[PDB]
């Protein structure tokens, strides 16, 4: 029981997030209302105070004499699902015959979509994102040819044994999900749920994954978010003997059922490395085009 007044009257524990704003339906662009001349003292829409941190509240109607316009222009194409639910390339896997990289007929790809700039720049507009996804696998030879070859794709979550050869016992796939498909078949396609241990994936994590001294050698771990590490994607030609053909698997991802939070400035310098915002210090370029003088076009 509580008896001293400061305890009774305290707000310690209020779990309700007091919100100053709320969403309104806006299926179309706003309309324009008729306006006329205003010759007044006291009323001054045009004057603002940007220091406050808010954007100007002045509208067309108050700055010029406007007509009435019934705007039926839709806002549907700018929803998160509209912007993001379009398949883009997020991974390429090579399976050569005579090669330096994967001459053994299998390959392991750590799932990380930050290797391609188009897709990456788009998702990095937000800090946190939660979504489901549709993955499509397009396979062919390096010339774009289709050959009668059978492949196995397996999803290996963190902790499951990664295959170490085309004949690894792990390909028994008694629990992991695998897809068996021919290059001659249409691209394989599957749905993936939101799998992070967190409520969202986060393209930016200002911190370290572990405790301890963060000495120079363990600085490559700054920014590493295990909550974003979903595992490995493994592929192999299905046989006990080497395949007769060199292959390429291109991975496309289409997000769906998207939610995003905390928008941020968009990347303006070329990307250099996966999941790390390093930029070339000697080649810092302006965000856009430049001109010779401010008084000339």
């Amino acid at each position: 029981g509580d008896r001293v007044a400061d305890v009774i009257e305290s707000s310690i524990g209020d779990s309700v997030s007091r919100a100053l704003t709320h969403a309104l339906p806006a299926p179309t662009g706003q309309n324009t209302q008729v306006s006329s001349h205003r010759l007044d003292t006291g009323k001054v829409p045009a004057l603002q105070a940007a220091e406050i941190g808010a954007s100007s509240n002045a509208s067309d109607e108050s700055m010029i004499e406007t007509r009435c316009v019934l705007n039926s222009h839709s806002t549907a194409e700018t929803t998160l699902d509209s912007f993001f639910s379009r398949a883009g390339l997020v991974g390429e896997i090579d399976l050569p015959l005579k090669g330096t990289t994967n001459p053994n007929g299998y390959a392991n790809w750590d799932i990380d979509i930050t290797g391609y700039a188009q897709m990456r720049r788009k998702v990095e507009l937000f800090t946190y994102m939660r979504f489901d996804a549709e993955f499509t696998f397009v396979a062919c030879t390096p010339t774009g040819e289709v050959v009668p070859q059978l492949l196995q794709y397996m999803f290996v979550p963190p902790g499951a044994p990664k295959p170490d050869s085309r004949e690894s016992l792990a390909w028994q796939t008694a629990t992991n999900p695998s897809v068996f498909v021919k290059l001659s078949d249409p691209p394989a396609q599957v749905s993936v749920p939101f799998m992070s241990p967190a409520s969202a994936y986060q393209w930016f994590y200002d911190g370290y994954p572990t405790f301890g001294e963060h000495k120079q050698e363990k600085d490559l771990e700054y920014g590493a978010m295990p909550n974003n590490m979903m595992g490995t994607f493994s592929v192999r030609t299905v046989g006990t003997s080497k395949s007769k053909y060199p292959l390429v698997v291109r991975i496309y991802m289409r997000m769906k059922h998207v939610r995003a939070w905390i928008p941020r400035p968009m990347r303006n310098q070329n990307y250099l490395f996966k999941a790390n915002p390093n930029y070339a210090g000697n080649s810092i370029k302006p965000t856009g085009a430049s001109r010779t003088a401010i008084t000339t076009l």
């Binding site: 007091r18 911190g207 250099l272 070339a280 210090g281």
Partner: protein, 245 residues
Amino acid sequence: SDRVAQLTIGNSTITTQEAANIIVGYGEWPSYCSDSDATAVDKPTRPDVSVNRFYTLDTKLWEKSSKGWYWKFPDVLTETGVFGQNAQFHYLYRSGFCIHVQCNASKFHQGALLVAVLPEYVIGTVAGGTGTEDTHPPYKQTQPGADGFELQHPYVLDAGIPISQLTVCPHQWINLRTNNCATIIVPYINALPFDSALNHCNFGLLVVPISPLDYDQGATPVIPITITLAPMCSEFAGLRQAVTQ
């Protein structure tokens, strides 16, 4: 009546006679974690007044050539007062913050500082200049503590993103002819209900001159920028011995 203000929390009070309203980040006030969002089962500790109060941590000098600085939260406070102690003894922490940046001059000085809060402010390096070396920033640059850290390349926020768009984040400006402070309230931002005050900085505070400081010879040339902040709705859990990192 919008230019004048008083912020009182704990045993501390701040006054200003040249304010520019108050920004409440993303439109919401700090709040404690709900029983449905929570996951850890131990009863949390909510010290209240001993930790939710204003702490004045640092003063920088604004010079005609300053590039700008940043601080990381809650890093700036992990070694200060009762808040720090709690952050060290507990694995889990969560809180909001009221940030009040101060800077006064005269009706004859000029300049404008952009004061903004950027969640998950991951720092990048110049990659050996040529961009061929995959270097990483050292602990002292990622978690600079109370002293903060000076920006090497403000135009790209030392992270390859344009400062020209930083206004998409909660912010205010300190434009000397207008105001002498910026006040921003920030709720707890993260993809988890609680986290480590040591391993993870939820956001960074940036103070960057966009319109350079200027004045005529003879006017006071020392123009300080002081940082004062107060945790709000602090909660801690997962108690054990104190740890500094």
